[PDB]
Amino acid sequence: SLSIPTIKQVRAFVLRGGGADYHDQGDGHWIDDHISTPMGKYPEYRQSRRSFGINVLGTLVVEIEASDGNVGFAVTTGGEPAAYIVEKHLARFLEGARVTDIERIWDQMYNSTLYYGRKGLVINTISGVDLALWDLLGKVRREPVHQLLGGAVRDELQFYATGARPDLAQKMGFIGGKMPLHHGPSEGEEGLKKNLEELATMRERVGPDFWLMFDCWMSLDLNYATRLARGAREYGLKWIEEALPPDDYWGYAELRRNAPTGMMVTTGEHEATRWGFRMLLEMGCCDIIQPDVGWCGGVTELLKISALADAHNALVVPHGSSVYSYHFVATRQNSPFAEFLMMAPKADQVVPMFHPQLLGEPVPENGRMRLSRLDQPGFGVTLNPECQLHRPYTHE
């Protein structure tokens, strides 16, 4: 017998520069420094990911106003094409609904966009609406999102750090260091040696116990990944992440079989929905699944993905997605540690992931975050008023 507000209006905005699009940069950043990609077989696209257009979309901001004056928002990747989808297509299912109608809303967004959806941009868009809906609901109930997700199961988050400097991540208190791979199969035996040299160097600097992992960003083939993982076992690599293109379900299962015993094969960043993850889990593709909350369907969908993994006794370590991941992973038994992305250009200082777009964003202190930092309603952040919002589309 609480008075549940209805949704008055949904708006989509475009923002540009850093934030929820991680690869929307323009400087001397590690995240654009010769990262191996599927495009790296072309020499002219090898140095920079921005050169093939990793930064083309920008940030989608979804804002949902309720009848009580509460506003939820989320940031994700999608920019102007995603804003068109929110305003012209998706908003019709939201406006006039109760803020508790979350299951209904997701299903309607998914079913209505199926003919041009399933994976990719359209699912990113759905996810951003979903996140904004969970933020709004938390704001309405005056509760952090983790309290709406069955409550935290640990009083502290522990992080590994993703970036070019695991050695410095160690000095900053993190439990591990995930490095990007810099050389793909088209650089032959020399690029392989270089990959292994980088790992050797970092291992020498950190000692035998600190976790090291490679992120390969879809860039290898089965034989190269097999040979890299075999080479890597000398330096105690914990896992090889996203070795293959996301459509290569058969390849991942082969790789996992051919991996050194005790080394993990992980994927799932570019996978969407319960049915994408069912395929990974059932085919044996995967030791850990690593969906992006903002790209896999949102919190609502990730909840079902996570329970799928629960039945499979698999780990779920989501893509670092600032508060959108922290509130989720706090509540999951199958998520014992979390990813933090190093968004400083030299990966040499801890910096908020969604700067400058977000305010109230907590960050790991000495590689940890107390649950008591996640005490504010919704996802506990506000949109920075200094950020320049464009609304390219309207509806009625």
The residues, any chain, with a CB within 8 Å of residue 42's CB and separated by 6 or more, are none
Cβ contacts of 349 within 8 Å, gap of 6 or more: 172
- Does 60 bind a second copy (CB under 8 A)? Our answer is no
**Nearest alpha carbon to residue 124 among 373, 290, 297, 306:** 297
Q: Lay out the site mask for Na ion across 213-232 (x = CB under 5 A, - = otherwise).
A: --x-----------------
88 binds a second copy (CB under 8 A): yes
Instruction: Assess 38 for contact with a second copy (CB under 8 A).
Output: yes
What part of residues 254-293 is at the interface with a second copy (CB under 8 A)? 258, 261-262, 264, 270, 273-279, 282, 287
Least separation in angstroms between CB 241 and Na ion: 5
Within 160-219, the residues that bind Na ion by CB under 5 A are 215
> What does the block give as tokens for 1?
């017998």
Cα–Cα distance between 47 and 34 in angstroms, integer?
4
Q: Which of 11, 46, 178, 332 binds a second copy (CB under 8 A)?
A: 332
What backbone phi and psi angles, to 5 degrees, belong to 141?
Answer: -80, -5
Q: How far is the C-alpha of 109 from the C-alpha of 214, rounded, in Å? A: 35
Tokens representing residue 103 in the block: 């299951």
> Which one of 118, 194, 355, 390 is in contact with a second copy (CB under 8 A)?
118
Q: Which of 319, 327, 390, 395 is catalytic?
A: 319
Cα–Cα distance, 285 to 244 (Å, whole number): 11
Kindly state the number of chain residues that form the binding site for a second copy, as judged by CB under 8 A. Answer: 109
Nearest residue to Na ion, using CB? 215
d(CA 200, CA 140): 51
| Residue 215 to residue 349: CA distance in whole angstroms | 20
- Annotated catalytic, 183? no
Pick the stretch among 15-23, 60-68, 133-141, 269-277 that binds Na ion (CB under 5 A): 269-277
The reply on whether position 135 binds Na ion by CB under 5 A is no
Dihedral sign computed on CA atoms, order 202, 21, 305, 323 = positive
Q: How many CB atoms lie within 10 A of CB 10?
A: 22
Q: With respect to a second copy, which residue has the nearer C-beta, 8 or 193? A: 193
Candidate ranges 27-35, 130-138, 262-270, 306-314; the one touching Na ion (CB under 5 A): 262-270
Does 327 help bind a second copy (rule: CB under 8 A)?
no
DSSP letter at 17 equals: S
CA-nearest of 274, 278, 216 to 245 is 216
120 touches a second copy (CB under 8 A): yes
Name which of 147 and 357 has its Cβ closer to a second copy.
147
Tokens 């109230």, located at residue: 360
Q: Residue 215 binds which entry of Na ion, a second copy, none, with Cβ cut-offs from 5 to 8 Å by kind?
A: Na ion
Please report, as residue ranges, which positions from 6 to 35 form the binding site for a second copy (by CB under 8 A): none
Least separation in angstroms between CB 320 and Na ion? 9
Which of residues 113 and 348 has its CB atom nearest to a second copy in the complex?
113
The pair of structure tokens assigned to 291 is 């969906």
**382 phi and psi angles, rounded to 5 deg:** -125, 155
Indicate whether 196 belongs to the interface with a second copy (CB under 8 A). no
Question: Least Å distance between CB 285 and Na ion?
Answer: 15
Phi/psi at 69 (5° precision):
95, -10
What is the footprint of a second copy within residues 143-172 (CB under 8 A)? 143, 147-153
Pick between residue 227 and residue 348 the one whose CB is nearest to a second copy. 227
CB of 90 to a second copy, least distance (A): 8
Binding window for a second copy (CB under 8 A); candidates: 54-62, 321-329, 350-358, 382-390: 54-62
Tokens found for residue 190? 């020399």
Instruction: Say how far apart CA 81 and CA 270 lie, in whole Å.
Output: 19
Q: What are the catalytic residues? A: 319
Residues that bind Na ion (CB under 5 A): 215, 269
